[PDB]
Ligand SMILES: Nc1nc(O)c(Br)c(-c2ccccc2)n1
Ligand SMILES: Nc1nc(O)c(Br)c(-c2ccccc2)n1
Ligand SMILES: Nc1nc(O)c(Br)c(-c2ccccc2)n1
Ligand SMILES: Nc1nc(O)c(Br)c(-c2ccccc2)n1
Ligand SMILES: Nc1nc(O)c(Br)c(-c2ccccc2)n1
Ligand SMILES: Nc1nc(O)c(Br)c(-c2ccccc2)n1
């Protein structure tokens with residue numbers, strides 16, 4: 004089963020980070036969310052009720068990305084992966100990629116980040 | 125067998141969507157189609173008749189992407205995957221990725237979508 | 246005097262547009278704001294008080310771009326140009342470029358928009 | 367008067383060109399249209415009737431770009447500039463930039479083209 | 488063994504294609520070549536003689552991409568995969584992706600192509 | 609008279625440069641050529657003989673960019689501007705922008721270059 | 730005289746800014762430098778001594794962009810414009826564009842900045 | 851276990867290369883580093899001490915990419931993979947992709963490079 008529903012390059016301005024200054028000023032966090040979901044019934048029926056509604060997923064991600072400031076991107080992706088799995092039984096697994104394109108790192112790079120894959124139990 | 129024939133970033137202006145307004149105004153749907161096909165005979169012969177003609181595939185995709193408006197992207201990719209497999213025996217499998225780069229979703233993202241992989245029976 | 250302070254590609258999700266559906270669903274409006282301001286005193290002094298603070302300008306633009314939905318982009322740029330000139334005497338002139346990259350227009354383009362230049366009186 | 371209404375990167379697949387093969391196969395023509403129009407009344411009124419409707423302009427461009435195949439891009443831009451000026455009195459001047467990003471030219475470039483500016487009489 | 492040596496987005500202007508007009512005018516063919524090669528000895532030694540020289544590979548690809556015009560991209564990738572495997576014993580496998588970003592296909596897409604993976608015997 | 613014929617982002621691999629190593633290894637030189645030419649007769653007639661043929665211009669640029677290695681980009685643009693003006697009476701003026709995106713300069717930048725504008729006498 | 734020597738998109742990680750946190754963490758500052766210089770003698774002679782050496786200019790910019798942290802971008806561009814004019818008599822005028830693509834501004838934009846043009850006296 | 855910590859498109863100006871001229875002039879080396887690390891404890895705890903600190907990783911990469919000039923990119927990636935594994939027990943495996951976007955190769959391509967994956971023992 005290789006079907007997926009995705010949300011690419013979602014961007015939020017938040018205040019997460021392990022450095023004090025980071026939390027004060029803030030920055031843009033890029034988010035990629037890919038969900039493993041069987042889409043053949045929805046492909047057959049065309050009924051939005053036989054699949055997972057991405058608008059709702061974006062809201063879940065947004066509320067976490069734009070909410071209380073935490074330390075790690077690991078903590079943000081885990082809160083997201085655990086929030087999507089809990090609310091949707093159709094999501095057999097959730098992958099969250101979070102990117103800090105502009106962290107307090109003296110250098111020239113395209114970005115730094117983490118990525119987790121969490122199956123739904 | 126890892127050979128593939130692909131059509132990348134095909135773009136169509138259509139009226140699909142589960143929201144009334146969506147169907148009225150319309151939007152651009154991005155499409156990525158990758159077909160699993162053995163290309164060694166065509167690689168040996170150079171005869172366009174020993175492989176799958178992509179122009180014809182683009183027509184198949186286009187006619188569905190620019191035809192009657194449906195609800196789900198799941199329904200569009202399923203109609204496409206099922207239309208390419210049916211007409212081409214050389215396509216051992218069909219993967220369809222459909223992206224809504226500008227859905228009625230209040231936010232900043234690069235796009236939302238679904239992706240299905242359907243083997244040919 | 247060719248000095249300028251600029252804000253490029255600001256993006257807001259708003260509900261402006263002359264079509265009903267437009268106001269319902271909404272879309273992303275891209276904004277470019279360039280202000281004619283003499284920057285030599287600020288260049289000499291280094292005091293943020295001898296120049297125009299762009300953060301404040303972004304707020305002005307944001308509040309208009311993300312506020313009550315109007316019809317024309319012409320009305321949005323005029324409200325912005327008139328709001329920046331009124332509040333800042335240092336701005337000898339204000340240019341506002343507003344782009345609708347994804348309007349309800351059946352076609353393939355990079356975007357449509359308007360641009361106004363309004364001197365401060 | 368520096369106000370403008372623009373349509374950027376419009377793209378059409380057409381069969382224009384001075385070479386036989388060109389007209390047979392065809393290619394993508396990129397089009398940039400910028401109109402000099404006073405937008406202060408529309409900025410004050412917010413009435414779409416005090417400005418020029420870009421949707422209609424896109425249609426004018428499209429119908430020429432996707433119609434009978436001609437030789438020169440000079441002929442296409444002249445037909446467009448002359449068609450927008452004729453139908454709109456508010457357009458004090460029309461600039462048409464047409465780009466052939468992939469002409470039958472053995473080389474590596476981003477594109478070739480022409481650009482004309484035609485005032486409305 | 489997941490080590491690889493790659494050549495990305497190589498571009499050549501050639502006259503391949505199954506349509507007469509195609510061979511007359513020509514077009515740009517994009518090429519991606521990834522070779523499976525054990526790079527630990529070269530990583531340990533730093534001697535260019537313990538790895539595969541990419542300059543030579545580019546020459547091999549170039550000479551085929553810019554040589555006699557064939558029909559299929561399948562034939563070009565097969566000639567390339569077979570030419571790199573034959574000349575280099577260190578290449579355990581060769582993957583060739585060929586893209587026609589601007590084929591004689593009436594539409595809007597990013598490109599069409601094929602991709603083959605050929606192990607070295 | 610604001611009409612223009614352009615050739616954008618032409619790219620050539622050459623050995624120009626004031627440093628010995630530069631001439632040995634070589635690099636990619638980006639070239640932008642914009643010609644001031646009255647295009648109304650060509651716009652009226654559609655005859656390729658009432659305008660300037662860009663294919664020929666690309667050849668002129670290419671032959672200089674890919675020929676004998678010189679020192680300055682100033683010398684390359686001057687040879688180009690002087691070669692286009694001499695051969696074409698319709699070109700009222702020639703602008704040549706040459707960019708070295710990857711010069712032997714220890715740093716992070718998008719590119720360095722020169723640009724000249726030479727009227728035809 | 731429209732000749733110019735340019736340095737585009739130079740990027741430096743520095744600690745400038747009017748906010749304490751800004752100076753602590755730091756960020757990437759993008760710089761565009763365009764110099765008005767007569768390039769015909771250099772175009773005729775090909776001698777690097779009849780024009781302005783951009784490598785040296787990059788060093789001047791770098792040393793200021795990567796040196797002591799100041800408040801305004803206005804102060805950085807003024808120090809740069811004044812440092813290039815002073816050291817080079819051939820530079821009839823200097824334009825400095827400085828961009829903060831990621832300032833401490835809660836929002837979605839491509840960047841904010843200033844631009845100054847300073848003639849050489 | 852599919853969790854990963856990544857550093858994308860890091861860029862350094864170095865003097866590596868097998869050609870004399872290469873080491874003299876130098877060039878920009880692009881680096882992609884992806885580390886296999888279990889991030890669930892860090893996702894649960896939010897303590898930066900239960901995961902791998904990317905800033906430190908960037909320093910490790912930087913010091914090698916900007917240090918003594920070697921011959922092969924294979925030698926640079928091996929030094930990096932071996933330096934990250936040695937210092938971090940949490941990194942179950944290290945993948946290093948090094949790209950030479952502008953090597954002394956007469957042609958038009960996006961880049962050439964190598965990629966290694968080294969598990970931590
Ligand atoms: N792995 C990881 N995840 C995060 O979310 C942060 Br913030 C850091 C980190 C902490 C301090 C300095 C640099 C990076 N490291
Ligand atoms: N999964 C899925 N596939 C589609 O094609 C649509 Br439209 C939606 C959807 C429906 C309503 C609101 C938001 C998204 N969701
Ligand atoms: N000039 C202009 N400015 C705007 O803001 C809009 Br919305 C429209 C318009 C109105 C109806 C259809 C198409 C475009 N036209
Ligand atoms: N100026 C100009 N405008 C056009 O539209 C074409 Br097609 C050509 C042309 C004709 C023949 C060969 C190359 C270019 N030249
Ligand atoms: N599979 C495949 N490989 C190629 O190289 C070509 Br050309 C075509 C093809 C042939 C005719 C029309 C459209 C595509 N099809
Ligand atoms: N102005 C200018 N034009 C060129 O073409 C070169 Br090469 C250089 C130059 C010479 C030496 C070092 C750095 C730049 N400078």
Ligand SMILES: Nc1nc(O)c(Br)c(-c2ccccc2)n1
Pocket residue numbers: 250293296297298299300301745746747748800801802803
């Ligand atoms: N004009 C200008 N130039 C700068 O260099 C800075 Br920093 C600011 C500024 C200061 C405080 C808040 C927001 C912007 N404003």
Ligand SMILES: Nc1nc(O)c(Br)c(-c2ccccc2)n1
Pocket residue numbers: 492535538539540541542543866867868869921922923924
């Ligand atoms: N495989 C490999 N790795 C490197 O790091 C270099 Br430099 C070269 C190489 C050597 C000489 C000419 C062309 C490429 N080849």
